[PDB]
Design a binder for this molecule. Structure first.
Ligand SMILES: COCC1(c2nc(C3CCCC3)c(C)c(-c3ccc(F)cc3)c2-c2nnn[nH]2)CCCC1
Length: 133
């Protein structure tokens, strides 16, 4: 499956504008500072129709499992309770989180040997780049 290109363990190597994205989302100062220091791993695997994405870090270990197009409840690493839907659109995993009349989108793209992750909240974008670990 086309989704195979995502499978593996990916380690954060660069981040841009993540603090301002986090402010836009509404993340509090202490969480911004501690989460911003971390170099998480993103562990993606597929079993049948179920995709699992784990985030492992000094800050928080999180895991989501989902089927594309099927909404699920997610507690985020900043402790928001959101409703999420993940789809594949033109080779990009598109993750929408909805809560309190707000929305943020996280797009995961394979580019070269990297996983490029674009996070958008209103007018504010952050890009985070992960490489195989
Ligand atoms: C909207 O979600 C964006 C992402 C994410 N969001 C957040 C919140 C702050 C903004 C709202 C959620 C946090 C704290 C982390 C995180 C987790 C552990 C950490 F140790 C550091 C940051 C991660 C993250 N997870 N994995 N890599 N970054 C970035 C790309 C992927 C998921």
């Amino acid at each position: 499956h086309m989704c195979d290109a995502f499978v593996g363990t990916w380690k954060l190597v660069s981040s841009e504008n993540f603090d301002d994205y986090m402010k836009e989302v509404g993340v509090g100062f202490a969480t911004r500072k501690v989460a911003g220091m971390a170099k998480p791993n993103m562990i993606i695997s597929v079993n049948g129709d179920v995709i699992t994405i784990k985030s492992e870090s000094t800050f928080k270990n999180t895991e989501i499992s989902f089927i594309l197009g099927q909404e699920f409840d997610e507690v985020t690493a900043d402790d928001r309770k959101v409703k999420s839907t993940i789809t594949l659109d033109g080779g990009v995993l598109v993750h929408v989180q909805k809560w309190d009349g707000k929305s943020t989108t996280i797009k995961r793209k394979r580019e070269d040997d990297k996983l490029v992750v674009e996070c958008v909240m209103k007018g504010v974008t952050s890009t985070r780049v992960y490489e195989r670990a």
